[PDB]
Swiss-Prot record:
UniProt modification remark: Phosphorylated and activated by PIK3CA.
Cellular localisation: Nucleus, Nucleolus
Transmembrane segments: none
Disease affiliated with this protein: Neurodegeneration, childhood-onset, with brain atrophy: An autosomal dominant neurodegenerative disease with onset in childhood, characterized by progressive cortical atrophy, developmental delay, developmental regression, loss of motor skills and ambulation, absence of language, and intellectual disability.
Subunit structure: Homodimer. Part of Pol I pre-initiation complex (PIC), in which Pol I core assembles with RRN3 and promoter-bound UTBF and SL1/TIF-IB complex. Interacts with TOP2A in the context of Pol I complex. Interacts with TBP. Interacts with TAF1A. Interacts with RASL11A. Binds to IRS1 and PIK3CA. Interacts with DHX33. Interacts with PHF6. Interacts with CEBPA (isoform 1 and isoform 4). Interacts with DDX11. Interacts with NOP53. Interacts with ALKBH2.
Signal peptide: none
Sections of the chain in a coiled coil: none
DNA-binding region listed in the record: 4-71
Function: Recognizes the ribosomal RNA gene promoter and activates transcription mediated by RNA polymerase I (Pol I) through cooperative interactions with the transcription factor SL1/TIF-IB complex. It binds specifically to the upstream control element and can activate Pol I promoter escape.
Modified residues (Phosphoserine): 6, 17, 68
Source superkingdom: Eukaryota
Name of the protein this chain belongs to: Nucleolar transcription factor 1
């Protein structure tokens, strides 16, 4: 495929999700944002971490598809195929 996108499951769904409010607080606090997010993810365990993945992994699809599509003229019909 492509390039559509490429979520990132964990760091994607969540980072973008929080980093915006984390970077916003200090207006470029990223330093804190990255931690507040990193830590907060690891201290949690598989709970957060694993699940964060699926959020953007669940979202990653859209985007896989963008690509694949391409190549998935079939990967679209002949798979990419549909194809069943």
């Amino acid at each position: 495929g492509k390039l559509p996108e490429s979520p990132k499951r964990a760091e994607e769904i969540w980072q973008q999700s929080v980093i915006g409010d984390y970077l916003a607080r200090f207006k470029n606090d990223r330093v804190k944002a990255l931690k507040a997010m990193e830590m907060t993810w690891n201290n949690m365990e598989k709970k957060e971490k694993l699940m964060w993945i699926k959020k953007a992994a669940e979202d990653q699809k859209r985007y896989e598809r963008e690509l694949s599509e391409m190549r998935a003229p079939p990967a679209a019909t002949n798979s990419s195929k549909k194809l069943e």
